[PDB]
Amino acid sequence: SGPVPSRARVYTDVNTHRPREYWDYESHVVEWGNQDDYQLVRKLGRGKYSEVFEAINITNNEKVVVKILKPVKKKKIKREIKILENLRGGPNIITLADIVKDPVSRTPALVFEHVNNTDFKQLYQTLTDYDIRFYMYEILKALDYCHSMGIMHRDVKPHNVMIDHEHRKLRLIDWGLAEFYHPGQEYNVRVASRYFKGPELLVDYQMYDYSLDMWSLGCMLASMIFRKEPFFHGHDNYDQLVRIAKVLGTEDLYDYIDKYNIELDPRFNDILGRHSRKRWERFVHSENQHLVSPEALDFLDKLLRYDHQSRLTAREAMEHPYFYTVVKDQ
């Protein structure tokens, strides 16, 4: 008598038709390379799950990136590895170049191709209207590819899109939260970063799919065209849904949760309020108007839907008039 089930409207059964080995990552046997090939140069960052270093492959003198892991849910290791191997060579997907055992941590270190990135806080202040469209199309190539392979990223955000602006090149990175989509499976709602979490996550609906990534992409688009970082600025996961409802309105939120027979956390009773849907022109002003067009707003509107089933798919998104002005290569 609980929630109504949901299925992806595209690529629904891709994994069910595959051999066990494609998606059964627990059974994957890791192929190890030689750690002596790599010399660490510069620490680039630390997450809760890993440390990331710039390095050099001493054999070819080529720059490289080393991610040294250590989870508590150790099955994440084989999941990330199998996903990266499955997706290797896809459009705009970061390439896993090697897997080595780190002598100090005694855990797997993932070795990736290098990308000469510019800081998004810096880059998202320079992007022209043309450049926003161009780079959005490139991200879509990556998302359609992984969705078609039966994989959802689940952590789409500006930090995970590495851009070499000089060569106009883009890579979707950090597949540590990525998962195989199986119809009917319930998933953990504690994925994605706060500002990019889809309404399905925020209302604790577990039977979600590829469409989660399209919400996240919509948040990125809104932040770029409106020059507002982040677009939905929640203090916590609960306030995050309130911020969304202040733009999309509460009546469509209740319509969404009623469709799937979901009950909001009663915590919302005294914080959600009653809000109308805003027209997107509300967010336009003299400083962002050169980035806004009727095409931009229409495309945005079709990504940022409460109902995960109603959002544009990656392939449909690439069909949108927003991308008509973009020169396609080649």
Ligand SMILES: Cc1cnc(Cl)c2c1[nH]c1c3ccc(O)cc3ccc12
């Ligand atoms: C924080 C973090 C987590 N996971 C990955 Cl795969 C990466 C990451 N930073 C990077 C990178 C940073 C710079 C780069 O040129 C390439 C990268 C390639 C992959 C990852």
